[PDB]
Every structure is written in structure tokens, then in C-alpha cells.
Design a protein around this nucleic acid. Structure first.
Ligand SMILES: [Zn+2]
Lengths: 98, 95, 362, 108, 81, 98, 80, 107, 94
DNA sequence: CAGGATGTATATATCTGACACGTGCCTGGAGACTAGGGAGTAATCCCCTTGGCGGTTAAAACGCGGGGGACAGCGCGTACGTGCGTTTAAGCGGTGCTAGAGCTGTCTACGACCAATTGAGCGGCCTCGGCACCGGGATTCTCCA
DNA sequence: TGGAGAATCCCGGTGCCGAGGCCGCTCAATTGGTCGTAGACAGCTCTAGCACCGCTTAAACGCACGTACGCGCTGTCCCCCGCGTTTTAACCGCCAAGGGGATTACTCCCTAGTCTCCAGGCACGTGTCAGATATATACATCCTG
């Protein structure tokens, strides 16, 4: 009985919360590890300025948010509210990345 | 040794105090303003370079800068920036 | 005396009687083999046998227990490197191939290792004929000196088939051929363009080994163009048909090829002379030939003697041009010792003056 | 002799440096020669554009009861104006966030 | 280092989606997003490392990243510009 | 009775015909008139090299074909075969022209 | 002096065919006419700017090629 | 007492012109100075890319039983290559046409 | 009386090398001109920027190589770099 | 299916204009030499990047119930495709004219370069006030009868 | 259309560190002059864009018929969301060491600049053959009884 919220209210509250903040939404140690692992294929024994990893993180988060916006537009177009990999594929195909 | 570096912080601050005599600015915002000024400086200068190269000339003049501003900025930004620029050059040549 | 020649030609037609059955049985096993090679997963997915015919005019053949077939393989973007500046042997490399070259394991650095690929070819063919034993068919492995994998079939008795791998390229007929195939004034320019838009072939053969990279040399093959031109051998392409007039071109070709076959095998010192010499010379004779009336079976013996004269004149001045590569003229002493060519000439004198006695066999 | 010096931006009537812009134009490999009135034009245009951004940014900072511009206010300014959004259309602003916007079909 | 793409947790892709304005998310979206992020990162880090090698340095600076982004049409203000 | 083709066969034949040609698919005098009318707002008493109008026509036809491709992709995405202005609007919104 | 109705409906169907389109709604023509008008207006504004800077009266093919190249729509075959 | 000229393209073994590329680099406002091996490198690269395109174009030409290359053949060469099509992704070729494709759902 | 230069001589030489029986139209030879000029401008602009980032004043083979590695995709860059290095190496041996 | 109609790829015969060479020549590239400054190198400092350790608490991960949205199926009705007969105006060929692009010569004002002064802008140091941050009460907003 | 839980805005006090101002100085902008050459005009040629006129015929246009596709409704059943508990590993503060970025000084060699000379690439002119066009066939595909 206590206070079960209906499906879709906490999602809207989170939309409103994260569209008002400016923080970074990915943890920093995992991202840094991933960056170093990706880079150890192009040249071994590399080093990174902290500003370099922060720049990479900012750029990647901006990219993924901007892509989720078009994914949402494609979902709405297909008469849905759930986003599916079809919508990501359509967005990246129209944008010209394929 | 200390390797003096340049930036547009003094002039951005003067413009700020002239448009909003009460507001301050953070340091990351001042970094963003420096990157912005460098960006559009580069854009206009490269467009004027190309313009001078297409027309067989070897000089960059205020006419080149005028038409690069007309090519790069949209709509009413271009109209007001061209008015500002022409007004400034008129005032300047009068010593 | 063209009747004796005509009945020996009939004799060749009785080898042919034996060899329709022999060739059909070999063809059928090789055909089954062909279908099986296309289904198995390996670098040899699409490998047709390239058809140049089955006739004696069309194929390698001698005594009834040896046959030959050609297997073609289409190859990606190929770049050739001349190794014999005569213009007859090449190194094979690839180009960018952005998707991927499914052959990089067959290359030694940037050059294609014919030896390794052929070793894989031999292994796969022997295993595959070994995996289905309807007809008694086995593999023989001889010295690695000429790359051919010979099957021995005991049905009815020994059948040998040398399997020769040939790469297929569709690219451009390289510059060494630029003034090859000269027929523009004989047949026409439209055919020559069409002929030269066809693909060309590269076959493994180790040019005698004053060289480091061995096997890694290839020779050009134009077997399909040669079959087409020969089977439209006349200025009138209606030759060898009912729609046209039968001429004595094919008869002279059979006469010289078989005469030489018998004379060269009975005097084994001259084996550097191969069947390609006769084909090249007859190509030149048929291209300079302006007249259809210069080939008619009632004048078979006179045209043949004229051909003999042509053969001595080719012999005389120390060059017999490769019909597709004039820059590579195989009549160089460095591959045929001068005395041996003249000795063959002496044998020609021997044959010419004796009234073709070697044909008085049966 | 040698009357008192007078900066070129003083004569032009600007707050941006005309001499530094002249030097950056003469050292950046843009052309062989650079006229005398080109850095004045360019400094006037740069000053116009920066003041145009800072006015909107200070307005956004005031509508949040804050006396100090931060990157979020610069982003709000840029994304809300229709002509600054076409100029800086392909630019990412560090610590800028997005514009609060929910599609109508998702509301309850 | 291996298996680090899994450190882009699902509750973080959900937060990126919330900031993107999406209300309901399928369950196959997370692997797609990891692949997309991985190819973006590869494309940017290859160019940053090319710049770094040309400069004959051994540390990747923030200017290498800013230039690698600028040459792909994703200019980034706030790190040196 | 004579030979009524079913709806969708001549459309596929036309697809195959126009994906094999290289001609220009817009008439030339109407396009030239339209170009001159559009340009007479920015400056009066202009003149045009023939090559200039041909370049404009080539560019515009390439643009419209490339846009109809993405419109078709959006239509297919929405479980349809007919293209509608919704699909053009989605394509131009994802591409970044809005 | 509309001249936008000179981009007829069959011409738009042909442009749709070349793009792999099978069926076409009836409200697509008025929408694509507006799209084409916007595109042409942008390109011709830039071309006329390039023309005026050179103190010319005619628009050349190079002005169009430059106006296109500066919008990310490079065009081969007309000079440059 | 001269050294009768030997072009730089001959020394490099190239067909493209090394001296014209040197001049275009110097009179183009790219840097203050230009090294001696920079035009050689740049002309070699331009020649490689040219040959790479022209070969795939002549192949598409001689597939259609043609002798001369037309713009359609350049287009077919560009678009049927996942790297040359990434280098020229936003370039338009005049009189080039499109690549033939129909969506599977429309058949 | 208005001498204007192009690249068609060298494009034709290269064509006669790779396909020594094929011709070229007059529009394809304009498209190849535009292509060569476009790629030239791209490579040269990127090498210029590269020399400006490192506070240098000259453009050398190293700038051209890094520009080629930045602008060409995948296996195109490997072959182009090998071509360039082979050409420079052969040129210095004189 | 099985014929019937239509569309498309395929062979020849004819003519044309566009491409491939060939020639004359002039301008731009090559050979030889000098003079400076940019860049390569070697050494030295000192900043900042990497690596470790320990504690805390915030976030991730795992489970579970249930409601709502995705997806398939069925019907209808209308809007779009196909085909035919009219009608409009595009395309082609030819004629005439003049505006404007393109070049050439003359000269003059304008921008580079240099030498000596001097003040603007940069680096460092210090301090208070704007803004986190925690409490604590007010007031919206969602979920049911 | 109510009433209660639970987020969320708003006010209040504390405190801390970063923005904003001052000071010292050095190097980069300004002033004043000289010089050479880029570009601004003035004239002149002659290309090529614009306006017109017939004429043919291909393409646009308007209309009718019918069908297949879009759209709306219904129903079911997974599968995502909201909540609660556990666990794990980011995050923060901290200390230590050494790699490598960054700056200075010194020297040489590589490139710009000039001058003389001559060959390669450009413009113009022919000659002919690849391809465009027209006619006649044969093969391929769609459609309906
Ligand atoms: Zn015959």
C-alpha cells in the first residue's frame, strides 16, 4: 500500500533533474581505464594529462546525449515511446556515420 | 623562464563591466570566452584569406573582412557587425 | 599425296574413338571433383575447370593414358613484375584490397609464394579424391620440379590427369602485350578490341632457375583467345562450318604437329621444342594470309609445303615471335641451342626429302 | 618632438587590441600584406560579438539570483538565441548541460 | 587492461538517456550504446595519438584532444581552444 | 482486359530506369527562370553564365535525391511504404537543417 | 512570376524514383518545393556575395562552386 | 660546362610534376619555408591516389564494353569502395548518377 | 593569350600506365582535375596547421606524412605513406 | 500451371564530332653559388603523472511484483497508381546586338622594414564576499473513493 | 469533486576558497622615416549572354477506375519500471618517487634569392574512329484464365 508510484513518474522526475544539472554522468575511474585500454593499441607506454581525459569525457557525454535525442525523435516517429536499437541505427544512418 | 602567455581576458572583462556593471565571471567561463574569440577570429581570417586568393590579390583589406563577415554570420548579426566595423574604421581614419 | 595424310588423320580419329570413352570417364571423375571442390570450405571456393575444348586440336594429349584439364581461379587485384626481361615470366603481387585478401598466408612478404599455395592445392585435391572411392582413383606425387598433380585411375586401367592450377585476372592485358595479337588488318579491329577485353591467365612454371625466387614466377596464358581465333581461323569466320568453305588450315596444323610429335619422340635429343612453336608459327601464317583461296583442302599438300618454307624462314633469321608478346621472342639461343634448332632443320630436311615415311606407319 | 603615444584601439574607439590583432594577422600566414584598416574592422566585429553574448549571459545569470556568469549561463544564452545558435551550432561547451525540453507525447 | 567497456554501467547509460529526454528504454540498448561509444572513442584517440607522436612527446595533452575533435566537426570550448 | 499492370510494377520499372541514367530530371527553362527570380532579390540586373545555372541544377538535383533516400528510410522505419511530409521533416531534423 | 510551379509533379516523381521511392503521398510536392526553394536561396545568396566582392555583374560557375564548397557540398566537374 | 637538366620528377621516378608542386606550395601561404623533400612526398601521394581511382574506373569502363572513361565510371569507382567513398563522402560528381539499389521491402 | 595550366598531362600519363588501351572523356578529365586540386588543398592545409601547432616555420616530409595519416582512411594511408617514403628515398640517392 | 502481351537486352549499318597526336614557342623550371637564420643537439631543472594505502559511503547489482505498452490480427474506405486522350510549352536551330569581362600600360599612394622609447599587460600575492552546504519548516503534486 | 504521503521550493546561518585588485617589470606596440611595388584607373577588344522567331513533338495535364495500403480498433502477454536489500569499489585525503616536458646555449646545414639558359607544357590545327542512332530479333518477365 505505502506509496507505489505509477510507471513513468520517476522517469519524468529524472528527466527534469538531469536536464537541469551540468555534472558528468559517467564514473571517472572506469572511463579513464577504458580510455587507456583503447589507446594502448595505437602506442604503448603512453601517459595522459588529467585535462585530456576530462576533455574526452565531456566530448563523449555530449555526443551520446545528442544521439539519444535523435533516437527519441525516431521512436516518437514510429508511434512508440520505448527506444530500441532500430532507432539508434536509423539515427546514425541518417546523420551519415554509416 | 616563466613563458608569458597571451589571452583575451582583460578585454572580455572590460566589455563585461561595460555591458553589465555589476556582474562577475567565473574562470571556466573566461576560458570559454577565450576559446570563442580565438575560434571566430580564425574563421573570419581564413575566409578573408581565401577571398583574397580567389581574386588574384595579395592583401587583406577591410573590404575582405566585410565580405567574410557577410558570408559567415547569419541574418541580423551580419548587419549589425558590418555597421559596427564600418563605424569604427570611419572613426579611426579620422585620426 | 593428301590421301595418305587424310587417312592418318582418320587414324587420329581412331585414337579419338578410344579417347571419347577414355576422355568421358576422366572428364566425369574430374567433373565430380569440380563440384566437390566448390562446396568445401577453403581458399579454393570458386574454382572452375577452364574449358578449351576436348579435341586433339583443343587439348594436351598423346598415348591414350594421359590427359590434361585446366582449372581456373579468379584472383583479386593483381600487380605483375617482369622477371625475365624477355617478357615471359612474372612475379605476382596484390594491391590495396580494402575489404581483405583471403590469401595473405600464401605470400612471402609482398610476393605470392606459388610453392606454398600449390602445396595446399596438392594436399586438398589428394584428400578430396581420397574421400570418395566410387572409381579406383589414386594420387601420385612425383619430384617437385614441374608443379602438376597427376591422378592415376585404374578404371579400366591407368588414367593419368595432370591438374594445372591457373589464376584468372580480369584487369588489363599488361603493357608487355600492347602490340600483341596483331590481326587488325586480317580479321578486323572490332574483334581485336572484343578479344582484348577478355580476361587472361597466369600459370605456375619455374623458369629455369638462374634466380632466387623459384616457383614464384608465372607465365602468361591466353588459351581461350587462342582456341577462339583458331576455331574461327579464317578471314571468313565461317570457316570449319557448313555456312562457310572448309579450308586446309586445321589439316596443316594437325599434319605438322603430329609429324613433329613422331619425329621428335623418335630422336629424343630435341625436347626443348614444344607444341607452342607450331601454334605461334601458324598464328603468324594465318594472320599474314590475306586470301581465303590460300587455304583449300584440294591444295593441302602445296599449302603444307609453303608452310614448311615459312618454317625454314622462321628458323633462318633467329627469331620466332610470341604471337601475344613480340618483345618476348622465344627463338633465342639462350633457351634453344643454335645447333639444336639447325639439327631440327636437318631433321626437317630428312622429313621433307623422304616423302613423309614416318607417316607410312599405322 | 615625439608626441605622446596613443593606442590604435583608442583612436578606433574599441576595447579590443588592434595592435595584437594586427600582429596575429601578420604572423598567421593569411596573406603577404595586411592593410591598415583590416585589424580595426576585425577588432570591432569581435568586440560586438562578445558583448552580444555577454549581455544575454548576464541576463540568464540574473534570472537565477546569481551575480557571476558560469558556463551554464553561456549555454543557456547561446541555445536560446536563434542567431547565436546557428553560429555556434556545432560547438560543445564544457559543463554546459542541455536545454530543458520534454516531448509533448511523453507527458501524462 | 581488458574488459573495461563494462565499466560503462547500465545505470549510467540510463542517466545519459534521461538527459537526452527519453522516458522508456529497451533492454538491448546498452550493448548498442557501448559499441557506439567505443567506435567514437577509437576515432578520437587515434587522431590525438597521431598528433602526440608527431610532436615527439610521450604524454597526450589536452590540446591534442581538442585538435582531434576540431578536425572532426565537434569543436569543444573550455580546455584551451 | 488488355494489359492492366498491377499497382507497383511500373513504379519499380521507373526506379530501375532512373537509377541507371545520368541525365537531369528537371526541365531547364523553368529551373533557370526560378533561379533568376530568386536571385533578383539579392541584387537587380544580374547575369548568369550558362555553366552557373548548370552547376546550380546539378547541385540541387543531387541534394533532393539524397534527401529522398533518407525520407524513404524513415518511411520504411515507420512500417510504411508511402513517403509523407512527416518523413521529410524527420530527415531534415535529424540531419541538422532545422 | 511564381516559377516554383515550374518544378512540376512528374519531375518530383522522377527525383523520387532515382532515390528508390515506390509510393508517394499527395502532400509531398508542396513540401519539397519549399525545401528546394530554401536550398537555392542559401546557395544563391552566397554566390551573389562572391560576385559583388569581385565587382562583377554576372555570376560565374566559380562563384557557385565556392558557395557550394563553403557549405560542405563540394562539386566536381565545373572548374576548381 | 653545364649539367644538362634532369627534372626532379625523373629523379623521384614519378609522373606528376615536382617543381610545379613546389611552386604551388611556396606561393600558397602555407608556411614561411618549404623543405626539399615535401613536394616529392606530396606528388608521390597524389600520383598514388590518381592511379588508384583511374584503375577502378577503367575496370568499370571495360565492364560496360567501353573504351573511354566517362563521369559515370568515376562515380561507380568511388561509391563501390569503402575507403574511397569515405574520402569523398560529401563530394558530388556532375553527371555521375547514383548507385542502383532498391530496398528489400519494396519488391 | 591567357595561358592556364592544369594536370591533364600527368593524369593521361598515369592512365596510359595503368590501362594502356583506355581513353578518357573531356568531362572526366575535368573531374580528375578538381579531385587533384581538392586533395592537394586538403593535405597542404593540414600540414600548415600541423607546423603552426608545433611553433615551426617550415613544411617538411614529416608534416606531409602526418597529414596523410590524418586524412586518409584505413589501408589508403599505409600504401600512400609507403609510396611517399619510397619516392623520397629514391630522390635523395642522387 | 500456360499461353499471351509487353518490355528489354542484343545484334548490325551509318554517320559524326570529339578525342588523340603533331607542331611552334615562350615562360617557367633547373644548375650553380652565397648568406643567414631555423632547427637539431645536449644539458638541466622541476613540475606533474603514476603508484600505493586506508576508510567511508554512495552507487551498482540483484530480486520481485505488476501494469502498461509493444505487437499481431481484422476490417474498411479512400487516396494513389495505371492508362488514355488533349493541350501547352520546352527544346532546337538560326539571327542579331551590345554589355561587360578580360587584358594592358602608368603612376601613385600604401604597406613592409628598421631604430629608439615607453607604457600596457602578464605573473605573483593577498583578501574578503559570493556561493556551497546543512537544517528546518512550507507548499506543491501524485495516487483513490 | 476530497486527503495524505513525499518531493521540492524557500528561508536562515556558517564558512571557505576563488575572483578581483594591487605592484613590479619587460617586451611588444607606437612614432617617425624611407623605399619599392601592388593595385587603382583609363582605354580598348571581342566574347558570350540576352532577346527574338518559327517549328516539331515530347512531356505535362486532366480524368476515370479500382485496389491495396494506411489507419483505427481489440486483445494478449512479456518486459520494463518502481522499490528494497546487499555488496563493492569509486572517491577522498595523503605521501613518495621519478619520467619527461620545457627552457637555454651553441653550431651547422638547409633553404631563400639571383642569374642565366633551355626544354616542357600550352595553344592551335587536323584526321579518323568510338559511340550515338535507327532497325530488326530474340529472350524475360508479368499476368490472368
Ligand atoms: Zn576451316
Amino acid at each position: 500500500k505505502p506509496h507505489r508510484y505509477r510507471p513513468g513518474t520517476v522517469a519524468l522526475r529524472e528527466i527534469r533533474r538531469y536536464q537541469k544539472s551540468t555534472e558528468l554522468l559517467i564514473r571517472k575511474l572506469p572511463f579513464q581505464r577504458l580510455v587507456r585500454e583503447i589507446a594502448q593499441d595505437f602506442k604503448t607506454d603512453l601517459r595522459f594529462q588529467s585535462s585530456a581525459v576530462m576533455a574526452l569525457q565531456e566530448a563523449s557525454e555530449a555526443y551520446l546525449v545528442g544521439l539519444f535525442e535523435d533516437t527519441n525523435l525516431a521512436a516518437i516517429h514510429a508511434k512508440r515511446v520505448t527506444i530500441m536499437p532500430k532507432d539508434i541505427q536509423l539515427a546514425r544512418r541518417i546523420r551519415g556515420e554509416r | 623562464k616563466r613563458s608569458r602567455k597571451e589571452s583575451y581576458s582583460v578585454y572580455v572583462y572590460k566589455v563585461l563591466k561595460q555591458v553589465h556593471p555589476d556582474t562577475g565571471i567565473s574562470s571556466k567561463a573566461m576560458g570559454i570566452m577565450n576559446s570563442f574569440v580565438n575560434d571566430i577570429f580564425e574563421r573570419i581570417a581564413g575566409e578573408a584569406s581565401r577571398l583574397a586568393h580567389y581574386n588574384k590579390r595579395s592583401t587583406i583589406t577591410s573590404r575582405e573582412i566585410q565580405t567574410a563577415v557577410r558570408l559567415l554570420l547569419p541574418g541580423e548579426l551580419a548587419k549589425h557587425a558590418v555597421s559596427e566595423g564600418t563605424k569604427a574604421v570611419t572613426k579611426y581614419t579620422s585620426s | 599425296e593428301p590421301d595418305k595424310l587424310k587417312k592418318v588423320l582418320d587414324k587420329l580419329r581412331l585414337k579419338r574413338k578410344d579417347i571419347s570413352e577414355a576422355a568421358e570417364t576422366v572428364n566425369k571423375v574430374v567433373e565430380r571433383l569440380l563440384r566437390r571442390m566448390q562446396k568445401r570450405e577453403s581458399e579454393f571456393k570458386g574454382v572452375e575447370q577452364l574449358n578449351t575444348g576436348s579435341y586433339y586440336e583443343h587439348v594436351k594429349i598423346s598415348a591414350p593414358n594421359e590427359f590434361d584439364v585446366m582449372f581456373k581461379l579468379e584472383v583479386p587485384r593483381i600487380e605483375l613484375q617482369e622477371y625475365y626481361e624477355t617478357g615471359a615470366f612474372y612475379l605476382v603481387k596484390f594491391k590495396r584490397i580494402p575489404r581483405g585478401n583471403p590469401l595473405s598466408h600464401f605470400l612471402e612478404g609482398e610476393v605470392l609464394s606459388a610453392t606454398k599455395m600449390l602445396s595446399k592445392f596438392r594436399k586438398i585435391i589428394k584428400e578430396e579424391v581420397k574421400e570418395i572411392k566410387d572409381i579406383d582413383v589414386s594420387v601420385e606425387k612425383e619430384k617437385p620440379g614441374s608443379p602438376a598433380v597427376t591422378l592415376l585411375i585404374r578404371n579400366p586401367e591407368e588414367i593419368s590427369v595432370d591438374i594445372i592450377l591457373a589464376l584468372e585476372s580480369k584487369g588489363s592485358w599488361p603493357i608487355s602485350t600492347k602490340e600483341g595479337l596483331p590481326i587488325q588488318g586480317w580479321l578486323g579491329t572490332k574483334v581485336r578490341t572484343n578479344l582484348r577485353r577478355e580476361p587472361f591467365y597466369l600459370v605456375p612454371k619455374n623458369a629455369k632457375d638462374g634466380n632466387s625466387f623459384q616457383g614464384e614466377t608465372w607465365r602468361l596464358s591466353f588459351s581461350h583467345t587462342e582456341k577462339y581465333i583458331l576455331n574461327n581461323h579464317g578471314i571468313e569466320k565461317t570457316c570449319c562450318e557448313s555456312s562457310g568453305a572448309k579450308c586446309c588450315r586445321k589439316e596443316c596444323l594437325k599434319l605438322m604437329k603430329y609429324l613433329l610429335e613422331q619425329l621428335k619422340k623418335e630422336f629424343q635429343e630435341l625436347d626443348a621444342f614444344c607444341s607452342y612453336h607450331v601454334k605461334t608459327a601458324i598464328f603468324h601464317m594465318w594472320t599474314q594470309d590475306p586470301q581465303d583461296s590460300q587455304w583449300d583442302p584440294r591444295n593441302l599438300s602445296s599449302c603444307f609445303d609453303k608452310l614448311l618454307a615459312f618454317f625454314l624462314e622462321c628458323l633462318r633469321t633467329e627469331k620466332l615471335d610470341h604471337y601475344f608478346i613480340p618483345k618476348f621472342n622465344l627463338f633465342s639461343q639462350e633457351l634453344i641451342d643454335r645447333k639444336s634448332k639447325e639439327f631440327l632443320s636437318k631433321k626437317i630436311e630428312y622429313e621433307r626429302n623422304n616423302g613423309f615415311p614416318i607417316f607410312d606407319k599405322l | 618632438a615625439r608626441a605622446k603615444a596613443k593606442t590604435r584601439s583608442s583612436r578606433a574607439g574599441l576595447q579590443f587590441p588592434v595592435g595584437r590583432v594586427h600582429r596575429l594577422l601578420r604572423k598567421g600566414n593569411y596573406a603577404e600584406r595586411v592593410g591598415a584598416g583590416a585589424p580595426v574592422y576585425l577588432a570591432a566585429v569581435l568586440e560586438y560579438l562578445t558583448a552580444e553574448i555577454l549581455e544575454l549571459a548576464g541576463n540568464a545569470a540574473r534570472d537565477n539570483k546569481k551575480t557571476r556568469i558560469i558556463p551554464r549561463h553561456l549555454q543557456l544564452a547561446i541555445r536560446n538565441d536563434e542567431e547565436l545558435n546557428k553560429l555556434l551550432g556545432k560547438v560543445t561547451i564544457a559543463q554546459g548541460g542541455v536545454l530543458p525540453n520534454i516531448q509533448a507525447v511523453l507527458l501524462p | 587492461l581488458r574488459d573495461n567497456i563494462q565499466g560503462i554501467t547500465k545505470p549510467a547509460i540510463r542517466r545519459l538517456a534521461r538527459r537526452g529526454g527519453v522516458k522508456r528504454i529497451s533492454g538491448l540498448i546498452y550493448e548498442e550504446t557501448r559499441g557506439v561509444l567505443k567506435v567514437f572513442l577509437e576515432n578520437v584517440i587515434r587522431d590525438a595519438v597521431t598528433y602526440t607522436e608527431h610532436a615527439k612527446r610521450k604524454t597526450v595533452t589536452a590540446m591534442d584532444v581538442v585538435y582531434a575533435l576540431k578536425r572532426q566537426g565537434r569543436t569543444l570550448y573550455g580546455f584551451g581552444g
